[PDB]
Design a protein around this ligand. Structure first.
Ligand SMILES: O=C(CCl)NCC1CCN(S(=O)(=O)c2ccc(I)cc2)CC1
Ligand SMILES: O=C(CCl)NCC1CCN(S(=O)(=O)c2ccc(I)cc2)CC1
Ligand SMILES: [Cl-]
Ligand SMILES: [Cl-]
Ligand SMILES: [Cl-]
Ligand SMILES: [Cl-]
Ligand SMILES: [Mg+2]
Ligand SMILES: [Mg+2]
Ligand SMILES: [Mg+2]
Ligand SMILES: [Mg+2]
Ligand SMILES: [Mg+2]
Ligand SMILES: [Mg+2]
Ligand SMILES: [Mg+2]
Ligand SMILES: [Mg+2]
Ligand SMILES: [Mg+2]
Lengths: 10, 227, 235, 10
């Protein structure tokens, strides 16, 4: 499982 | 894009977003940046969403192909992985070019300065994901340097629960874990960030509450994954 | 570049592009493979179809969003809005027309004439009907009339062959009839013909469903369900 | 609701 980065959302 | 008025480029970026045409959206926003005015918060969001969608698609493709390539190990998968890789590097270079030529130098306030330095860190990080050898070392250093400068500014100028500050710290922690082989630093950064953000959450404006709480959740989720 | 590429390599890369959800690349690899001048296998027809339908499907969805915004804007009739959306809708439209023209070119230059069996011939004529239909969706005026006629002609030829040569439950025959019924309803403003075709297709397929090979059962029953759903919508 | 055509599946 990959680490989660800042999502591409407003 | 040079021929179109800035207002028209922004309008078309918004249309492209609605149509889920992110390559077009990114090109419109590049044109708008090239007009030489600072971007508003809304416009930074347009720029970010557009290019992240484009590179995100390329990263996902690259990962699929790299996996097939490694499992395999004819020439086809290597060739095609290289093709996608080159395209991905092209987009990253375009973004880094815009940041260097227009956005970082021309930013006035701390928020926008930090946002652009974070973005520089991110796109060097995406280059690092596909890099090998000595190139990789230089790219990793460039990412680290951009993130560190952003961190230094954000700590001096921005509240701990500011969404830009949080998003930067989240991404820098990912850099530490996934790129720099520094899990101790990734975990320490994420935990310190989470705690300091929670400690000041009561001061955060309601306009940012949804975004900041999302990032803090992602810090928590990464911490669970990493420990 | 692709003229000199091994056909087998182009097919392999089309498969890789599919796994990577890189449909524009996938389509380009399959165009290259078609241009080798050999007949396609079933798998290859699937690759060709999936690739181009993903590309044009995205463009169609975008065009619909923009056309809606454009019309809403024009209806509001503000002295100051509308030019940008029109221009951008036109840009997407032009790109969509380009892809459709590419597909129709492949069908006319390589695939229809060179097909060695009725099943594949019907598939390609259906595809010709479909891509003229997608052109018809964005066409206006007299151009629209000619394009609609072209779609109708391709579909009719496909229907004529399929009725003579293929079982009523064959997935290609079913998919053709479903799409031709949609053409009748949405493009040709012929709801009576749409409903009649869909009902006849459904009933004739159901009548022979007990003979269906297991290999096709899932696909045929899916298309029959879509015929039913359209019939419910249209009545 | 638009009419449904043949889905883009194998
Ligand atoms: O500059 C202003 C004000 N607005 C532009 C924003 C600032 C924040 N960044 S981000 O840090 O990438 C980010 C943080 C949280 C979440 I949820 C998603 C993304 C996006 C662009
Ligand atoms: O030629 C052979 C054997 N195989 C290629 C196939 C033949 C069928 N067509 S289709 O008619 O578009 C279609 C029908 C039902 C469904 I569910 C989905 C698509 C796709 C390509
Ligand atoms: Cl390639
Ligand atoms: Cl500083
Ligand atoms: Cl445009
Ligand atoms: Cl006949
Ligand atoms: Mg201007
Ligand atoms: Mg204007
Ligand atoms: Mg100016
Ligand atoms: Mg390379
Ligand atoms: Mg200033
Ligand atoms: Mg060959
Ligand atoms: Mg008004
Ligand atoms: Mg036009
Ligand atoms: Mg033959």
């Amino acid at each position: 499982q990959r680490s989660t980065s800042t999502p591409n959302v407003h | 894009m040079g021929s179109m008025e800035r207002a028209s480029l922004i309008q078309k970026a918004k249309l492209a977003e609605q149509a889920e045409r992110y390559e077009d959206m990114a090109a419109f926003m590049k044109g708008a940046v090239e007009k030489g005015e600072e971007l508003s918060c809304e416009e930074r969001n347009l720029l970010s969403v557009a290019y992240k969608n484009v590179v995100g698609g390329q990263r996902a493709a690259w990962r699929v192909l790299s996996s097939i390539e490694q499992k395999s190990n004819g020439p086809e998968v290597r060739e095609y992985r290289e093709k996608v890789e080159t395209e991905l590097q092209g987009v990253c270079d375009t973004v880094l070019g815009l940041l260097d030529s227009h956005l970082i130098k021309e930013a006035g306030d701390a928020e926008s300065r930090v946002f652009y330095l974070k973005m520089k860190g991110d796109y060097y990080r995406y280059l690092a994901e596909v890099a090998t050898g000595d190139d990789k070392k230089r790219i990793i250093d460039s990412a680290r340097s951009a993130y560190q400068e952003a961190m230094d500014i954000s700590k001096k100028e921005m509240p701990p629960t500011n969404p830009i500050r949080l998003g930067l710290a989240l991404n820098f922690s990912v850099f530490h874990y996934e790129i720099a082989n520094s899990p101790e630093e990734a975990i320490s950064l994420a935990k310190t960030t989470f705690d300091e953000a929670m400690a000041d959450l009561h001061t955060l404006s309601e306009d940012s509450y949804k975004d900041s709480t999302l990032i803090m959740q992602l810090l928590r989720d990464n911490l669970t994954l990493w420990t």
